[PDB]
Design a protein around this ligand. Structure first.
Ligand SMILES: Cc1cc2nc3c(=O)[nH]c(=O)nc-3n(C[C@H](O)[C@H](O)[C@H](O)COP(=O)(O)OP(=O)(O)OC[C@H]3O[C@@H](n4cnc5c(N)ncnc54)[C@H](O)[C@@H]3O)c2cc1C
Ligand SMILES: Cc1cc2nc3c(=O)[nH]c(=O)nc-3n(C[C@H](O)[C@H](O)[C@H](O)COP(=O)(O)O)c2cc1C
Ligand code: SF4
Ligand code: SF4
Ligand code: SF4
Ligand code: SF4
Ligand code: SF4
Ligand code: SF4
Ligand code: SF4
Ligand code: SF4
Ligand code: FES
Ligand code: FES
Ligand SMILES: [Zn+2]
Lengths: 1178, 235, 67, 118
């Protein structure tokens, strides 16, 4: 080898020869875009995103294919490269039909993940929904109570029946969160920076919330006695109760924000003080100066500003109303003042608006409610005079106006009508025509002509350096969520400025669908919206009690289940979206004809969408090169190309094995794997690495969860990065709602729930009674093979405590390897498959274990020779040099005789290392050698190194013994790259056997039939469902105790049913098929709070056994060391484990070579039944 | 990874055209020197062309390399049919270019033809008169190439379609502003970004018609009419 | 019918690199490529079905509708 | 480049081409003695401590000079290797005039580092 010297982006690198530019840049922290590149597949070159400019070459070179040479200067961000990538991304977008974010998210000024928390509500994850809200909205309940909800005006469900009650759902989850201790987001470590926020309103409190999250020291100066702003001294109590506001503000203060109330800028505190003692200052003073009437006599007593009147009412200060009240205005202030006056005892309240009803800035619902309460309205009427007699207002003279022409707004301009004047008698007049920023609070700042503070758009920075502004002080009176969005943006900008580099807010570019029409939803089911509970007008027009009430949990879930899931499910992991955000792509110029070919499918696991396919070919290449099924392919040619299954058939009707590799490799959400949850929702999950337990290959995986629900599973890029159908998709049982979480005991002949202590006491007493009455060896323990090593060891200890040697499993087959070699284990490891010369795959190795099929495919591609022994067709027969279809073990006897006849056995060494040889020769002396056996013997003799892969769950023990004999005769045992590997049927078969569970189904059944065994303790097995003939056998047991995840058919006939938890809720150790010890991590906490080990430890402590996880692990390590099996990659290197230290050659009579058996493990049997019902393969 | 080093089933293969194989035996029997005495210094020997279009006498012509295109069009082709003015030659086929009237003296040669943008291609020279409209011709061959793309890489699969719709909008008169700059940028990006030669030579008509007949496009898009009066939507 | 393809599949057997010739022969015989005939080719010759459909739909000469 | 498949002490390794056995064992946590090996210098072969037994080769191969090839089975602790290294160490010690620990340390029953704290 030679170290090549390259230069990438003006950084000198010493890379290795034979490497692509992509690998070198990846290993040197240089980002190169790529969409059609995978490490396991040969280069394709389709997308053309990885183009880099190499000095000395005229054309841009693909980094996924070009190999680094010596003296190479590579520029991965030159303007030519940027233009090429931008054009490629624009071309890819021109044919893209998707929705990066739903219209509900885009319509919200704060861009709250409306679809996210709606879907989380539909799944029962209320705390996760609240946490998602608080990422953009610190006040879920308060804003949910008071918001015009523009998101519902843009909700796509408007096209079906009625928009989703997003505000109601947010209020519901906010109420749930506030009912208990509130949710505080994680706080970054203190940065030692002080920020001064002026104003305790939504904008200031939002800035404090999103700056304290960054670790800054936040103080909020508030002039009013209590924080809240116009959410407290504006909006009345019947629309927003102040207890909720107090609770939210207390939650904010719990984050470390110091709110100094009664401190006023310019009166109690000075701007210079803030600019000197604080790094940054954010002004959120708001518009706190109501506009005067603008007509003569506006200063007469009895005329009061709208916001001042509402502040007096809220503060419980004495206000001077009367029988007659007039309100001038049409906004929220006017309507709130009118309804407050109605509730304050005014006999008649009339609202005067210069425009008509249609142009009322207030919401229609508020106006209708006020009309119900008794407020009268006069439209097209504007004030011109205040008639006052003795310094107190007696009436007001208005000039009737009419809609004359257009105006600045563009809709309609009211103009006065000459000769039209009306006198309205009013003891009180409330001028609520709007508010303006108080000039006193904003002294020393440059003011916009409108009176608001002038700030630089995108940076929220005032004229003074280090002083920021936002909210109603900048934009004028708007809705509260706009102020919250301004506060959040200003907080982000202020954090950037404090870090040193001030960066203006950049709005991302989203792919959106604007061609949608209601005819696209003509097939969706129409569901009624959640009812709104509104207090009676007569009873509510007299008090300040809240009008609307929060929805119930059932109604909230039913409402959130109405969502259409408009946004892309792959938004948080799409790379096309990331790349189009990284480049200034203009898609409109290249927009043109776009295909619409998505048709819904019935596949329960994988969903394919042709409209979001960038035709990178990754799914086809991974189904053909790695998996080896080749169930996908290109169809048509040119612009009409589409990735389709075999003959365009549904994925279930093809040879697809539901591995999910195509979904895991797709970059742009065209192929996705459906989440194992009630409602699909695109969420940012957290991934934890654990080990699959559904067979002995022990594939590691990353379980991605959000809350207590599992949302996805991804393969680990260890080797071929592959998962089969089970590991990838059968993790759905963790979220299953049919799981039992509390024990069941038999009361009055029926199973009913109880406590864990009583159930375990009953279990112990029943076992002790059986042992006492029927003596020793009368209790059978039938444990599943998916338990950890510690649990199996604890079960063995408990069996010793019960004086019973019947410790076994119904999934356990009769052993042959321990009578030949000494240990029932695989001699070698999975790492020697690649380096062996010949592979003998016996049984349904590829069909049962898809990952092992991929491993064999890779090994044969690397140079190995494959010989498949089976009875039916196998996927490995394509690359096999020799294929044998057999049904008897006479084939192996004939092979042994052929080996002996051709003198391919060195009799001296075999007789030295293997007793029982002459009897084997005598046994094989009479069989007839066939052509197939002779060919197999010639193949074996000509191989330097040989590995025999045996599917233990579909191969009889006679075949295993004969193959062991064949390996021993040709001296292919105890050496590197030679040996026998058993692929066990369940996750921890090897560990269970090593711990002491070594009794097969037949022995236990025979003991029960004789009447020797009278009780059974079944741990997560399903004898009744898996085998019907066992139903009578279980009838012979006096006592049955079941420890299962689900209430199985065998748990319904038990006396005590104890609940187990999934393997993602239990930490421990498992053993791979080759003997490798792997760790089961804790992805989720146990749902009932008790792990399987905890339950078994309680039961054992009831018997006087003092154990824990560490002690059991130590005992397991000692047991493995005593058998010379601990951390040993190759077995029998020094000598065999038989007492003679020699091979006891397998001599027996002929028998069927392969067997078909059921699965007794509960979860695996359930998932296999599910796959059979759905007509899927694996 | 070249076919000479890894071709059919991973073993080295030599893929050659029919014409070079046919020229080989003559080279062997008459010697290399005799063959090298025919043609320019860069291109040796003779080349076969398929004269068609508005030429007087179409068919196959075997001409020495370096013989001027004017000689082929007039002396051998017999001139333009009906004695009309000679506007351009669509040399190379659907992936070739429109060499204009003033470049009629560019000698037949790989380098001399390529220096004008067009390619030797399938030797199919489509002789065209002043009646033919350039936008339709560029849109005609681009449509064929877009239909004949395999669809692997983005630049050729979807870029050619965007160019085809841009050309259609130009011809129909319904084209917006910025169509010429956008079309040129799209063509040069497809040409320099496509994987195989069917995409790198796909926008050759457009580009060539934008180098010699830009005024035709400009009159098409601004004046909403064509001087050649061939676009059906504008007659 | 499917026996009509029996000679063709017998002539082009032993190598899975002659699928285009078999598809052309089927196109000549049936005047189109029915999904049952493509299934029969996939079963008899041993090439994956997706490859058959891709090579069938790649060319404009092959039509999958009755004429 | 190509990835070579080797087997060192019954542990399968996927190493890179053009690497010595010493580098592969160092990067895979396998200890091979060496005294005359430095990464910046060309191999010397004097001490003969890095000898490993390679299947298919009759002589012990120096790990500081031998390059890993495909399908290589290396035993770095076989009795032949142990005897070779022990003989080399005895030969090196036969000409060594030193004092690993001073007599004061050896005379102390607790073997306190007398020279150290003095
Ligand atoms: C009557 C009324 C009804 C409304 N109804 C709705 C509704 O139904 N839905 C909706 O979405 N929006 C509604 N709004 C709008 C919403 O209340 C405001 O738009 C929002 O609160 C703006 O907040 P802000 O932080 O910009 O300023 P504000 O909340 O107006 O005030 C911020 C804070 O600044 C403080 N302050 C002022 N001057 C100083 C100073 N010199 N020093 C220190 N502190 C100072 C004040 O004490 C106040 O606490 C309503 C507004 C009003 C007036
Ligand atoms: C779309 C396309 C079509 C082609 N068609 C032919 C062709 O029909 N005949 C041919 O000889 N080369 C054709 N080529 C060129 C071949 O890729 C290749 O250059 C040629 O076989 C080289 O032959 P030569 O060495 O005799 O020049 C074509 C190339 C492309 C991109
Ligand atoms: S696939 Fe990616 S780019 Fe397309 S809509 Fe979904 S998230 Fe957006
Ligand atoms: S804050 Fe208002 S606009 Fe935003 S999602 Fe909630 S109701 Fe809709
Ligand atoms: S249906 Fe759901 S995702 Fe779509 S706009 Fe409405 S709330 Fe958002
Ligand atoms: S899920 Fe089916 S189609 Fe997808 S890669 Fe696996 S076998 Fe192929
Ligand atoms: S569906 Fe297949 S070809 Fe299309 S983007 Fe996904 S992985 Fe690529
Ligand atoms: S092969 Fe076995 S370990 Fe791997 S994913 Fe499938 S069931 Fe799980
Ligand atoms: S440029 Fe070539 S490889 Fe790319 S899509 Fe077009 S024909 Fe296929
Ligand atoms: S005397 Fe010194 S140099 Fe010699 S072996 Fe001891 S410590 Fe090493
Ligand atoms: S062309 Fe290299 S990643 Fe697509
Ligand atoms: S280290 Fe001394 S011979 Fe290799
Ligand atoms: Zn025209």
């Amino acid at each position: 080898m030679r170290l090549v010297r390259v230069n990438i982006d003006n950084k000198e690198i010493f890379a290795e020869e034979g490497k692509t530019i992509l690998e070198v840049a990846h290993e040197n922290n240089i980002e190169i875009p790529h969409l059609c590149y995978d490490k396991r597949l040969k280069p394709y070159g389709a997308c053309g995103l990885c183009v880099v400019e190499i000095e000395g070459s005229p054309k841009l070179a693909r980094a996924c294919s070009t190999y680094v040479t010596d003296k190479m200067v590579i520029k991965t961000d030159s303007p030519r490269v940027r233009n090429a990538r931008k054009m490629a991304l624009e071309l890819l977008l021109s044919e893209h039909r998707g929705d990066c974010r739903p219209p509900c998210v885009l319509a919200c000024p704060a861009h709250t993940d409306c679809q996210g928390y709606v879907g989380l509500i539909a799944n029962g994850q209320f705390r996760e929904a609240v946490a998602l809200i608080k990422e953009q909205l610190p006040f879920p309940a308060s804003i949910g109570r008071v918001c015009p909800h523009p998101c519902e005006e843009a909700c796509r469900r408007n096209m079906v029946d009625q928009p989703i009650a997003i505000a109601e759902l947010k209020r519901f989850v906010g109420d749930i969160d506030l009912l208990d201790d509130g949710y505080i987001p994680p706080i970054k470590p203190k940065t030692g920076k002080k920020v001064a926020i002026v104003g305790g309103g939504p904008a200031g409190l939002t800035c404090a919330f999103f700056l304290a999250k960054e670790g800054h020291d936040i103080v909020v100066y508030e002039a009013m006695p209590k924080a809240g702003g116009m959410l407290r001294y504006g909006i009345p109590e019947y629309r927003l109760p102040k207890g909720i506001l107090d609770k939210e503000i207390e939650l904010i203060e719990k984050m470390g924000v110091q709110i100094k109330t009664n401190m006023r800028l310019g009166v109690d505190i000075s701007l210079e003080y803030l600019r000197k003692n604080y790094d940054a200052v954010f002004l959120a003073v708001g518009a706190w100066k109501s506009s005067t009437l603008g007509c003569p006599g506006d200063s007469a007593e009895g005329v009061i500003g709208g916001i001042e009147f509402l502040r007096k009412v809220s503060m419980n200060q004495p206000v001077n109303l009367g029988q007659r009240v007039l309100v001038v205005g049409g906004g929220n202030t006017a309507m709130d003042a009118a309804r407050t006056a109605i509730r304050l005892g005014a006999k008649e309240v009339t609202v005067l608006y210069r425009r008509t009803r249609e142009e009322m800035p207030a919401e229609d619902i508020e106006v209708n409610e006020a009309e119900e309460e008794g407020v009268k309205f006069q439209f097209l009427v504007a004030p011109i005079e205040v008639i006052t007699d003795g310094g107190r207002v007696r009436a007001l003279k208005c000039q009737r106006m009419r809609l004359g022409d257009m105006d600045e707004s563009g809709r309609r301009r009211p103009v006065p009508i000459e000769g039209a004047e009306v006198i309205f008698e009013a003891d009180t007049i409330i001028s609520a025509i709007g508010q303006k920023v108080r000039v006193e609070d904003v002294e020393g700042l440059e003011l916009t002509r409108h009176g608001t503070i002038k700030v630089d758009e995108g940076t929220y920075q005032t004229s003074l350096e280090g002083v920021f502004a936002g909210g109603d002080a900048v934009t004028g009176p708007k809705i509260a969520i706009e102020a919250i969005a301004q506060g959040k943006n200003a907080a982000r900008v202020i954090d950037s400025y404090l870090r040193g580099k001030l960066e203006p807010i950049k709005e991302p570019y989203y792919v959106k669908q604007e061609d949608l029409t209601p005819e696209d939803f003509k097939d969706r089911e129409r569901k009624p919206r959640v009812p709104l509970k509104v207090a009676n007008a007569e009873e509510r027009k007299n008090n300040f009690r809240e009008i609307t009430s929060t929805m119930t949990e059932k109604e909230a879930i039913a409402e959130a289940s109405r969502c259409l899931e408009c946004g892309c499910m792959d938004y948080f992991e799409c790379q096309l979206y990331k790349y189009v955000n990284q480049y200034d792509v203009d898609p409109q110029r290249l927009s043109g004809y776009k295909h619409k070919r998505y048709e819904p499918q019935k596949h329960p696991f994988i969903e394919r969408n042709p409209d979001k396919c960038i035709l990178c070919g990754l799914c086809i290449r991974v189904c053909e090169e790695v998996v080896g099924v080749c169930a996908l392919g290109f169809v048509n040619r040119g612009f009409e190309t589409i990735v389709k299954p075999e003959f365009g058939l549904p994925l279930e009707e093809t040879s697809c094995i539901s591995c999910g590799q195509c979904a895991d490799i797709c970059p742009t959400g065209a192929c996705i794997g459906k989440q194992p949850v009630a409602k699909q929702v695109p969420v940012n999950t957290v991934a934890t690495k654990t080990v699959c337990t559904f067979c002995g290959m022990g594939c590691e995986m990353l379980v991605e969860t959000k809350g207590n629900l599992i949302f996805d599973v991804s393969p680990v890029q260890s080797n071929e990065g592959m998962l089969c159908a089970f590991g990838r998709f059968g993790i759905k049982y963790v979220n299953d709602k049919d799981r039992i979480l509390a024990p069941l005991i038999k009361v009055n002949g029926e199973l009913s729930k109880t406590t864990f202590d009583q159930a375990l006491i009953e279990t112990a007493k029943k076992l002790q009674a059986i042992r006492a009455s029927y003596g020793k060896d009368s209790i059978a323990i039938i444990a599943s093979q998916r338990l950890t090593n510690e649990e199996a060891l604890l079960l063995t200890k408990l069996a010793q405590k019960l004086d019973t040697t019947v410790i076994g499993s119904f999934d356990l087959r009769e052993s042959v390897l321990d009578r030949i070699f000494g240990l029932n284990a695989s001699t070698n490891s999975f790492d020697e498959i690649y380096s062996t010369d010949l592979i003998v795959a016996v049984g349904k190795v590829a069909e049962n274990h898809a990952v092992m099929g991929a491993k064999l495919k890779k090994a044969v591609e690397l140079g190995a020779k494959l010989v498949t022994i089976n009875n039916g067709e196998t996927r490995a027969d394509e690359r096999a040099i020799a294929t044998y279809k057999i049904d008897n073990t006479a084939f192996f006897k004939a092979t042994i005789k052929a080996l002996f006849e051709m003198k391919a056995v060195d009799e001296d060494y075999v007789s030295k290392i293997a007793v029982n040889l002459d009897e084997l020769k005598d046994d094989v002396k009479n069989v007839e050698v066939t052509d197939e056996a002779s060919e197999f013997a010639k193949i074996i003799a000509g191989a330097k190194t040989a590995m025999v892969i045996v599917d233990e769950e579909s191969v009889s023990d006679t075949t295993i013994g004969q193959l062991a004999n064949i390996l021993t005769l040709t001296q292919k045992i105890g050496r590197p790259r030679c040996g026998i590997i058993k692929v066990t049927g369940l996750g921890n078969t090897q560990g269970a056997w090593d711990m002491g569970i070594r009794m097969s189904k037949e022995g236990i059944v025979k003991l029960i039939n004789e009447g020797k065994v009278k009780a059974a303790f079944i741990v997560s097995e399903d004898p009744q469902a898996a085998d019907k003939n066992l139903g009578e056998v279980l009838d012979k047991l006096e006592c049955l105790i079941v420890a299962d995840v689900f209430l199985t058919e065998t748990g319904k006939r038990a006396d005590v049913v104890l609940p187990l938890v999934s393997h993602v809720e239990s930490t421990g150790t498992v053993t791979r098929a080759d003997g490798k010890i792997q760790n089961l991590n804790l992805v989720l906490k146990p749902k009932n709070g008790l792990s399987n080990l905890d339950l078994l430890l309680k039961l054992a402590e009831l018997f006087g056994l003092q154990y824990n996880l560490e002690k059991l692990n130590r005992e397991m390590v000692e047991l493995l060391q005593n058998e010379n099996k601990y951390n040993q990659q190759i077995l029998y290197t020094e000598g065999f484990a038989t007492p003679d230290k020699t091979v006891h050659l397998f001599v027996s009579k002929d028998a069927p070579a392969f067997v078909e058996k059921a699965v007794f493990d509960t979860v695996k049997n359930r998932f296999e039944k599910y796959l059979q019902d759905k007509h899927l393969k694996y | 990874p070249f076919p000479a080093q890894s071709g059919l089933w991973g073993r080295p293969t030599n893929i050659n055209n029919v014409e070079t194989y046919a020229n080989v035996p003559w080279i062997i029997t008459n010697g290399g020197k005799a063959f090298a005495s025919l043609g320019t210094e860069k291109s040796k020997g003779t080349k076969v062309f398929a004269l068609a279009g508005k030429i007087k006498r179409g068919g196959l012509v075997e001409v020495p390399m370096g013989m001027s295109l004017r000689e082929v069009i007039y002396n051998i082709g017999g001139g333009i049919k009906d004695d009309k003015a000679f506007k351009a030659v669509q040399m190379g086929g659907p992936s070739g270019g429109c060499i204009p009237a003033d470049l009629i003296d560019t000698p037949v040669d790989y380098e001399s033809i390529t220096k004008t943008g067009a390619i030797m291609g399938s030797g199919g020279m489509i002789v065209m008169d002043e009646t033919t409209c350039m936008v339709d011709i560029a849109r005609f061959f681009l449509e064929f190439t877009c239909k004949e793309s395999c669809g692997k890489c983005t630049y050729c699969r979807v870029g050619t379609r965007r160019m085809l719709e841009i050309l259609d909008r130009i011809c129909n008169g319904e084209g917006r502003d910025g169509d010429l700059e956008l079309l040129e940028e799209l063509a040069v990006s497809v040409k320099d970004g496509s994987l195989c030669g069917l995409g790198q030579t796909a926008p050759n008509p457009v580009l060539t018609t934008l180098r010699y007949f830009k005024d035709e496009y400009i009159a098409h898009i601004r004046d909403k009419k064509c001087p050649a009066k061939q676009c059906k939507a504008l007659i | 019918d499917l026996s009509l393809l029996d000679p063709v599949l017998d002539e082009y057997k032993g190598e899975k690199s002659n699928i285009i010739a078999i598809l052309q022969k089927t196109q000549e015989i049936y005047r189109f490529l029915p999904l049952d005939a493509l299934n029969y080719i996939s079963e008899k010759t041993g090439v994956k079905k997706a490859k058959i459909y891709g090579i069938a739909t790649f060319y404009a000469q092959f039509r999958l509708k009755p004429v």
